[PDB]
Write a protein that binds this DNA or RNA. Structure first.
Ligand SMILES: [Mg+2]
Ligand SMILES: [Mg+2]
Ligand SMILES: [Mg+2]
Ligand SMILES: [Mg+2]
Ligand SMILES: [Mg+2]
Ligand SMILES: [Mg+2]
Ligand SMILES: [Mg+2]
Ligand SMILES: [Mg+2]
Ligand SMILES: [Mg+2]
Ligand SMILES: [Mg+2]
Ligand SMILES: [Mg+2]
Ligand SMILES: [Mg+2]
Ligand SMILES: [Mg+2]
Ligand SMILES: [Mg+2]
Ligand SMILES: [Mg+2]
Ligand SMILES: [Mg+2]
Ligand SMILES: [Mg+2]
Ligand SMILES: [Mg+2]
Ligand SMILES: [Mg+2]
Ligand SMILES: [Mg+2]
Ligand SMILES: [Mg+2]
Ligand SMILES: [Mg+2]
Ligand SMILES: [Mg+2]
Ligand SMILES: [Mg+2]
Ligand SMILES: [Mg+2]
Ligand SMILES: [Mg+2]
Ligand SMILES: [Mg+2]
Ligand SMILES: [Mg+2]
Ligand SMILES: [Mg+2]
Ligand SMILES: [Mg+2]
Ligand SMILES: [Mg+2]
Ligand SMILES: [Mg+2]
Ligand SMILES: [Mg+2]
Ligand SMILES: [Mg+2]
Ligand SMILES: [Mg+2]
Ligand SMILES: [Mg+2]
Ligand SMILES: [Mg+2]
Ligand SMILES: [Mg+2]
Ligand SMILES: [Mg+2]
Ligand SMILES: [Mg+2]
Ligand SMILES: [Mg+2]
Ligand SMILES: [Mg+2]
Ligand SMILES: [Mg+2]
Ligand SMILES: [Mg+2]
Ligand SMILES: [Mg+2]
Ligand SMILES: [Mg+2]
Ligand SMILES: [Mg+2]
Ligand SMILES: [Mg+2]
Ligand SMILES: [Mg+2]
Ligand SMILES: [Mg+2]
Ligand SMILES: [Mg+2]
Ligand SMILES: [Mg+2]
Ligand SMILES: [Mg+2]
Ligand SMILES: [Mg+2]
Ligand SMILES: [Mg+2]
Ligand SMILES: [Mg+2]
Ligand SMILES: [Mg+2]
Ligand SMILES: [Mg+2]
Ligand SMILES: [Mg+2]
Ligand SMILES: [Mg+2]
Ligand SMILES: [Mg+2]
Ligand SMILES: [Mg+2]
Ligand SMILES: [Mg+2]
Ligand SMILES: [Mg+2]
Ligand SMILES: [Mg+2]
Ligand SMILES: [Mg+2]
Ligand SMILES: [Mg+2]
Ligand SMILES: [Mg+2]
Ligand SMILES: [Mg+2]
Ligand SMILES: [Mg+2]
Ligand SMILES: [Mg+2]
Ligand SMILES: [Mg+2]
Ligand SMILES: [Mg+2]
Ligand SMILES: [Mg+2]
Ligand SMILES: [Mg+2]
Ligand SMILES: [Mg+2]
Ligand SMILES: [Mg+2]
Ligand SMILES: [Mg+2]
Ligand SMILES: [Mg+2]
Ligand SMILES: [Mg+2]
Ligand SMILES: [Mg+2]
Ligand SMILES: [Mg+2]
Ligand SMILES: [Mg+2]
Ligand SMILES: [Mg+2]
Ligand SMILES: [Mg+2]
Ligand SMILES: [Mg+2]
Ligand SMILES: [Mg+2]
Ligand SMILES: [Mg+2]
Ligand SMILES: [Mg+2]
Ligand SMILES: [Mg+2]
Ligand SMILES: [Mg+2]
Ligand SMILES: [Mg+2]
Ligand SMILES: [Mg+2]
Ligand SMILES: [Mg+2]
Ligand SMILES: [Mg+2]
Ligand SMILES: [Mg+2]
Ligand SMILES: [Mg+2]
Ligand SMILES: [Mg+2]
Ligand SMILES: [Mg+2]
Ligand SMILES: [Mg+2]
Ligand SMILES: [Mg+2]
Ligand SMILES: [Mg+2]
Ligand SMILES: [Mg+2]
Ligand SMILES: [Mg+2]
Ligand SMILES: [Mg+2]
Ligand SMILES: [Mg+2]
Ligand SMILES: [Mg+2]
Ligand SMILES: [Mg+2]
Ligand SMILES: [Mg+2]
Ligand SMILES: [Mg+2]
Ligand SMILES: [Mg+2]
Ligand SMILES: [Mg+2]
Ligand SMILES: [Mg+2]
Ligand SMILES: [Mg+2]
Ligand SMILES: [Mg+2]
Ligand SMILES: [Mg+2]
Ligand SMILES: [Mg+2]
Ligand SMILES: [Mg+2]
Ligand SMILES: [Mg+2]
Ligand SMILES: [Mg+2]
Ligand SMILES: [Mg+2]
Ligand SMILES: [Mg+2]
Ligand SMILES: [Mg+2]
Ligand SMILES: [Mg+2]
Ligand SMILES: [Mg+2]
Ligand SMILES: [Mg+2]
Ligand SMILES: [Mg+2]
Ligand SMILES: [Mg+2]
Ligand SMILES: [Mg+2]
Ligand SMILES: [Mg+2]
Ligand SMILES: [Mg+2]
Ligand SMILES: [Mg+2]
Ligand SMILES: [Mg+2]
Ligand SMILES: [Mg+2]
Ligand SMILES: [Mg+2]
Ligand SMILES: [Mg+2]
Ligand SMILES: [Mg+2]
Ligand SMILES: [Mg+2]
Ligand SMILES: [Mg+2]
Ligand SMILES: [Mg+2]
Ligand SMILES: [Mg+2]
Ligand SMILES: [Mg+2]
Ligand SMILES: [Mg+2]
Ligand SMILES: [Mg+2]
Ligand SMILES: [Mg+2]
Ligand SMILES: [Mg+2]
Ligand SMILES: [Mg+2]
Ligand SMILES: [Mg+2]
Ligand SMILES: [Mg+2]
Ligand SMILES: [Mg+2]
Ligand SMILES: [Mg+2]
Ligand SMILES: [Mg+2]
Ligand SMILES: [Mg+2]
Lengths: 271, 48
RNA sequence: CGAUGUCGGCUCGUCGCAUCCUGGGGCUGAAGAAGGUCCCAAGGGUUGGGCUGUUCGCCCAUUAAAGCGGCACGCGAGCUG
RNA sequence: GAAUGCCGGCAUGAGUAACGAUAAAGAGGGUGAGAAUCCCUCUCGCCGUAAGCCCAAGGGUUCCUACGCAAUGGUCGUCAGCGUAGGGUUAGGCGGGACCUAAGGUGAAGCCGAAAGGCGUAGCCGAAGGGCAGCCGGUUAAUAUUCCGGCCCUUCCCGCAGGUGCGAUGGGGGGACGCUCUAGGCUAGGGGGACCGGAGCCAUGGACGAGCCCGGCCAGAAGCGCAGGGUGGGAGGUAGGCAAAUCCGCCUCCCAACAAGCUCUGCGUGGUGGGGAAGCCAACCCCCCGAAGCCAGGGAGCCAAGAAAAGCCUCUAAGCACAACCUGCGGGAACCCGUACCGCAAACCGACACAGGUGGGCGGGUGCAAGAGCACUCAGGCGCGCGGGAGAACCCUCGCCAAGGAACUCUGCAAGUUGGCCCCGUAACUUCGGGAGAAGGGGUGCUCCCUGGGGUGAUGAGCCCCGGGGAGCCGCAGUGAACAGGCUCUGGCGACUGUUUACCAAAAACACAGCUCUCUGCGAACUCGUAAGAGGAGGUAUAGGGAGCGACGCUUGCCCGGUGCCGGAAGGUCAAGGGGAGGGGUGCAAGCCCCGAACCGAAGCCCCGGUGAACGGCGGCCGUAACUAUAACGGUCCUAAGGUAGCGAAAUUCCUUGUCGGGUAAGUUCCGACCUGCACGAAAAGCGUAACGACCGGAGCGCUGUCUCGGCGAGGGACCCGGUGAAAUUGAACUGGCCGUGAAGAUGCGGCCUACCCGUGGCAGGACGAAAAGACCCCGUGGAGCUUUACUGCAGCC
RNA sequence: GAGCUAGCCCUGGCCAGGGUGAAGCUGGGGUGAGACCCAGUGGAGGCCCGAACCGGUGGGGGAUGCAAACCCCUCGGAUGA
RNA sequence: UGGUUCGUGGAGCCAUGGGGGAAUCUGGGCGGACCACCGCCUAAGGCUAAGUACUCCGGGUGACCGAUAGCGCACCAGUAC
RNA sequence: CGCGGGGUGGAGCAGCCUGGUAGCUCGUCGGGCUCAUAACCCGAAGAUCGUCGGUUCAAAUCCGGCCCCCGCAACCA
RNA sequence: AAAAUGCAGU
RNA sequence: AGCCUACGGGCAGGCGCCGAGGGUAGGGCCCGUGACUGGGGCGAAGUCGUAACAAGGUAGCUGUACCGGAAGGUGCGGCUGGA
């Protein structure tokens, strides 16, 4: 819903945090086999590989069910909707009748105590997962897999969601969130409905800090470095680049396509 | 002001240790070199 | 060039005369008072601000007058920067 | 005999600078060969969130004792952190280890790499984190939670009694977590007492006083209280906890729930053990304040959403039930290492007994609003390891000044003013928060009287915490000393807090929220790596990488000719390779060998078209209005298209101090304007903007030694005496002026002049003074960093 | 060679005292119901003042130093990037 | 592609990372593109003294040094620092 | 002070590389069309080619000397 | 499709 | 602490409140004037086009928005005061 603050301090006037009514009900994550030592570290065996990472508030991980076909047919009641620092969407905790409990990227609308389930049959509606093939051409859907038995990978951030665009044999066409028109295998699962927390994209960090609380260290412009560092660098007196916007490593950055050429992954795309 | 040498035993032992040396081919060849020169200490003698 | 620190300021001066005053003096289109010009003469004088890093100027207010030059564009083992 | 040569010795500067914080000294006793400097005492000063106590790291015998003084000690030394010798460090409970896991490291399995070796699961290693049993005293010259005394515990092993399905590396719970704000009880700690206990004291005019002065606790099993922290009990089903389960987890079912009970802490109290001031060679009580600590896993609120593992409960597996656990109570058993001493420092990091640097705890009392601030002061520790005189210049630090009051100057640089608390009272502008401590005022001490609530009590006295009113007293002055904003107007740049050139730049630079472009569908793109593997991410387009812009407001024009990027199943060209017309060498031959044309052959390039918050660009010359002047209008050439809004002598304007206006007595700066913009202009953003700024500019007021213009004064040096005693430099020197001369700026040649010999305190004109084989400059077929449509390669990628 | 320094990771600690008074709650007002307005409570913030602590503005001193970056006065941050 | 004297050169031989891919004496390699003659030699498994190299070590020597020489060390030196 | 480009009918531009030819728009003048004016239609007229000398048979053209114009430079100190 | 203008006073 | 005294009292003298006004500081309203600047009204025969009035030769007008030497043009909607 996005909350706004009074100007009782600059960098506040503008700032705006996320409204947490959707969550509520449960603050501390589910102790139970659910949190893990989420290991911070902005780079591999030594050197940094993703500049400007680091800093940022301590964060615990919540293991969520990214393949609900685990417990097929076993229905569960959605116990609570908790906050997740690890992602943009909210996760919802659900107690299965199987006794067992586990998390699941909280879909838009999913409400407390309501029941939900997954199976090649579940009542087409909010929170139910079923192999893409059994889902009504059209009906939106999130946490979609990309290959049978390899877990959800598509549509997982607040508001994301793909649409069933039509069937085409062994496969089914989806118009991913990006807009690319993908062909996902029929068996791939996917849970009905969208992602929720759609307001996410509106929070304005506000100050330079916050940007830090998220673990994002200042990011300097090539322009401000020297020939030695970046290519844009150098020049005695502020510069207009010098043909044609590039990245610290060489490669042009305005327009140059990069996705692999002969990737067998084509054949199932369009857009 | 706060000079460069800030003595620490666990450091010294762990960085220039006899074991640390033996563990790297470069480190092994250091000893080989010293022993061969006759140094009285090979590994910066420390103590705990 | 195995270094002769480079503007201006400040401080300290000292020298030249082609003299801005003040002393003599000839012309004058010098009646007077003033001025002009030239001659002799530095002995001693030769202001305080506005602007500028400025030297220099331009203004302001006075003055008998507010002279021009040399001293490594005097003077950074004296200061400032 | 020269290499700013190498090694060594000894010179000169020179008895010169200095002797390391301006916290500070004096004297009388000792000691001794010798004492300003060692010991004792008495004055005196300094620190006292330390300049005092404890702990860590680091150092490693520096500890204590007895002898010593060559050297070490910036002097002296009888002293010592020095030399020599001899002692000294005691733990089941403190800290490490026969416990745990974090990052990270290592690494059976496994993956990878010419070799070296790189990854990597488990496991292992890994600690200021988790876990775990000691408190108060007394002793030594030197160790003590270590030895001793009292009280109190922890494991293990065994025997015994009495209990129970006992039992895992396995399952579950728990261990378990953030930040800001906080409740109620306590304790530490402190302030008082008309009370208890004490040696003593009445001085110097007065007080034998409810006088002065000293001190009135600590540790403590079980039980008991008072604060809390934890915790629903049942009973049925079970598709889950990689079911082995009566444990978790789920549903269902009585009862019960701002609770009781059951537990676990903390704090009192507790048998009893201990200590126990000031003073001249033995009490142990009652008021009050009160934690940032305890009860602690307390409670609330918030968004950025807050380790793990073992100990510990509990569950069942084989097993085994003659075991075994569990509770008792006795007996026994309880290893290794560390423990001296320094520890904001003379024992650590800085070559030094070095004004530097060093993490954690305690850190008393009075006053000032508060406080860890400031002044003084307990406890405790210090006077800084050269001294003694003198009272020049000159420098440092500090105090004051007649009249003036920024005239100083690049600049009010520096210094001054202001300076706390309370009450009045405060403008433009504004993003309505702010600007605001805006400005500008008044109050401020002590005395007596009246009087309001609070906390603790008990409602009532005390004791504290806020106050309100009225009279009154003394000073030049009451935040009487210390800590302690000078204010306003107006531009520029940047929104803002922030970041930077360790060691000359703190900015208008970098960052920053936020805007846009672009890449990327996940074994993502991107990065690192030969690879394996890893980051990206246990993320998934509201996400991630690159780029520019840089809050916000109003906006961001025109040009795809060239360049980049994007799209183009046609064309043109194109390398292997396919294809072989056709030719060649040899053999007597079959053959064997060679060349080799058509055509077919990718990417790329050409080519077509898109593309500007992609590189980038965004004109000239003539003429014309009925006064002139000017030119809304026209002609013409050129372009890919000729600069829109807005701004403009500006961080941009050369001519320039443009020209008007303002401020000033006077204004190359400054502010407002104009615009022929040498050479603004729209995300290398354009124009603005409240607030913010140790940023840069201009003006006012306040005040001032900045200045007219200096004067005096204080102290630490400088100066004299004792003591210790360097340095760069140095061809050798018996080293004057002028006018000449000279490789062109002479103590050293020439001529003239002046000049007895040697120092001391001072000034810096000269010795082309010192110091760096000049940074600039050029030279060298010297070198490095950087660049690109220079050459040529390689990674990469197609 | 990261015992200095730069960043990051794991785990700990530190930040006197004073001020401003946001969101919320609550009551009153308000309306058809609201928005909203009032007091009170509340205790937010790369908020304000200022020690520790982290800096290094400006000036002076120092320049064979106390010191191969020091000292004095002064000044910036001081619940946060 | 490397090796040789051999730097693509008329470039054989000797190795061999890629592709294709035989025969066993009427078999198969060489004699510097290639043919033909003529001649050498037996690939795709292995072992093999000695003559050669070196001087930590012991010995003998020197138109070698004689403590700034000679080894860095005549000495308690890879020490002090 | 230097290196450039340029000058042609009234105006604004071509021909100048590689000599003999002077081209274009506009304007000008003469005619029409309109009541008239523009605009349109038809027909012309005008060029020391900046000057001086050189070269050639012949120069605006090639060559130098001047004269005017509008550009770019003027760096290390 | 398209296709401008008409001086002052009167 | 004076004078006259008719003496607890009166005057002088002293202190205090307020107080004209002066001073300092900060606001508000009005008037004048100001380089430069914005349009406005007016002035016998100026320059450019021709928007409107006759389907004014693109029906006109209108609120708005963008663009343009200028009248004006174009988009969206609206009116008829046009067909
Ligand atoms: Mg690793
Ligand atoms: Mg490593
Ligand atoms: Mg940046
Ligand atoms: Mg830079
Ligand atoms: Mg680098
Ligand atoms: Mg580069
Ligand atoms: Mg550049
Ligand atoms: Mg370390
Ligand atoms: Mg010299
Ligand atoms: Mg005269
Ligand atoms: Mg006369
Ligand atoms: Mg003179
Ligand atoms: Mg002179
Ligand atoms: Mg000169
Ligand atoms: Mg000079
Ligand atoms: Mg300067
Ligand atoms: Mg010689
Ligand atoms: Mg020597
Ligand atoms: Mg001397
Ligand atoms: Mg002297
Ligand atoms: Mg001296
Ligand atoms: Mg001393
Ligand atoms: Mg003696
Ligand atoms: Mg004696
Ligand atoms: Mg340390
Ligand atoms: Mg130690
Ligand atoms: Mg010793
Ligand atoms: Mg002794
Ligand atoms: Mg001695
Ligand atoms: Mg001595
Ligand atoms: Mg001792
Ligand atoms: Mg000793
Ligand atoms: Mg014991
Ligand atoms: Mg372990
Ligand atoms: Mg390894
Ligand atoms: Mg590992
Ligand atoms: Mg621990
Ligand atoms: Mg222990
Ligand atoms: Mg001791
Ligand atoms: Mg004991
Ligand atoms: Mg059984
Ligand atoms: Mg007490
Ligand atoms: Mg008594
Ligand atoms: Mg229950
Ligand atoms: Mg059950
Ligand atoms: Mg007790
Ligand atoms: Mg006693
Ligand atoms: Mg374990
Ligand atoms: Mg059991
Ligand atoms: Mg000790
Ligand atoms: Mg300390
Ligand atoms: Mg030391
Ligand atoms: Mg000392
Ligand atoms: Mg020290
Ligand atoms: Mg105190
Ligand atoms: Mg105070
Ligand atoms: Mg404290
Ligand atoms: Mg203090
Ligand atoms: Mg004191
Ligand atoms: Mg003295
Ligand atoms: Mg004065
Ligand atoms: Mg005065
Ligand atoms: Mg004044
Ligand atoms: Mg003034
Ligand atoms: Mg002056
Ligand atoms: Mg100042
Ligand atoms: Mg001050
Ligand atoms: Mg004002
Ligand atoms: Mg302002
Ligand atoms: Mg005030
Ligand atoms: Mg008083
Ligand atoms: Mg003081
Ligand atoms: Mg003072
Ligand atoms: Mg300016
Ligand atoms: Mg800034
Ligand atoms: Mg800042
Ligand atoms: Mg710096
Ligand atoms: Mg700053
Ligand atoms: Mg600085
Ligand atoms: Mg894409
Ligand atoms: Mg990966
Ligand atoms: Mg920028
Ligand atoms: Mg285009
Ligand atoms: Mg273009
Ligand atoms: Mg194009
Ligand atoms: Mg292309
Ligand atoms: Mg092709
Ligand atoms: Mg271009
Ligand atoms: Mg005219
Ligand atoms: Mg004026
Ligand atoms: Mg002016
Ligand atoms: Mg000035
Ligand atoms: Mg101006
Ligand atoms: Mg321009
Ligand atoms: Mg530009
Ligand atoms: Mg643009
Ligand atoms: Mg741009
Ligand atoms: Mg900008
Ligand atoms: Mg501004
Ligand atoms: Mg700041
Ligand atoms: Mg002035
Ligand atoms: Mg003075
Ligand atoms: Mg003096
Ligand atoms: Mg003195
Ligand atoms: Mg002496
Ligand atoms: Mg002599
Ligand atoms: Mg001479
Ligand atoms: Mg001579
Ligand atoms: Mg002398
Ligand atoms: Mg001198
Ligand atoms: Mg001197
Ligand atoms: Mg010199
Ligand atoms: Mg040289
Ligand atoms: Mg240079
Ligand atoms: Mg070269
Ligand atoms: Mg480090
Ligand atoms: Mg502390
Ligand atoms: Mg505070
Ligand atoms: Mg409120
Ligand atoms: Mg703050
Ligand atoms: Mg502050
Ligand atoms: Mg810094
Ligand atoms: Mg400060
Ligand atoms: Mg401040
Ligand atoms: Mg933080
Ligand atoms: Mg091969
Ligand atoms: Mg062959
Ligand atoms: Mg052959
Ligand atoms: Mg042959
Ligand atoms: Mg063989
Ligand atoms: Mg031998
Ligand atoms: Mg001999
Ligand atoms: Mg010999
Ligand atoms: Mg030797
Ligand atoms: Mg000898
Ligand atoms: Mg032309
Ligand atoms: Mg012409
Ligand atoms: Mg005609
Ligand atoms: Mg000519
Ligand atoms: Mg001709
Ligand atoms: Mg010509
Ligand atoms: Mg140049
Ligand atoms: Mg240059
Ligand atoms: Mg007309
Ligand atoms: Mg008329
Ligand atoms: Mg008044
Ligand atoms: Mg006015
Ligand atoms: Mg019209
Ligand atoms: Mg019309
Ligand atoms: Mg019309
Ligand atoms: Mg036009
Ligand atoms: Mg248009
Ligand atoms: Mg319409």
């Amino acid at each position: 819903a996005v909350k706004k603050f009074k100007p009782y301090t600059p960098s506040r006037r503008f700032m705006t945090v996320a409204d947490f009514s959707e969550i509520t009900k449960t603050e501390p994550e589910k102790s139970l086999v659910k949190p893990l030592k989420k290991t911070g570290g902005r780079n591999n065996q030594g050197r940094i590989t993703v500049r400007f990472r680091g800093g940022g508030h301590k964060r615990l991980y919540r293991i969520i069910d990214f393949k609900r076909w685990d417990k097929v047919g076993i229905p569960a009641k959605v116990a609570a909707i908790e906050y997740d620092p690890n992602r943009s969407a909210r996760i919802a905790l659900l107690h299965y009748v199987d006794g067992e409990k586990r998390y699941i990227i909280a879909p838009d609308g999913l409400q407390v105590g309501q029941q939900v389930v997954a199976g090649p049959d579940a009542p087409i509606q909010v929170g139910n997962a079923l192999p893409l093939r059994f889902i009504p051409v059209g009906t939106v859907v999130h946490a979609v897999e990309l290959e049978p038995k390899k877990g959800a990978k598509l549509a997982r951030a607040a508001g994301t969601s793909a649409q069933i665009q039509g069937r085409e044999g062994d496969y089914v066409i989806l118009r991913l969130p990006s807009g690319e028109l993908r062909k996902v295998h029929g068996e791939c699962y996917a849970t009905v409905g969208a992602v929720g927390n759609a307001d996410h994209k509106n929070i304005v960090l506000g100050k330079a800090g916050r940007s830090r609380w998220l673990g994002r260290r200042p990011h300097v412009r090539g322009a401000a470095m020297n020939p030695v560092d970046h290519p844009h660098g150098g020049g005695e007196g502020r510069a207009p680049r010098g043909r044609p916007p590039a990245s610290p490593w060489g490669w042009q950055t305005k327009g140059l396509k990069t996705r692999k050429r002969r990737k067998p992954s084509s054949r199932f795309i369009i857009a | 002001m706060k000079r460069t040498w800030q003595p620490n035993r666990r450091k010294r032992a762990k960085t220039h240790g006899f074991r640390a040396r033996m563990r790297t081919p470069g480190g092994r060849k250091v000893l080989k070199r010293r022993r061969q020169k006759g140094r009285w200490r090979l590994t910066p003698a420390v103590r705990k």
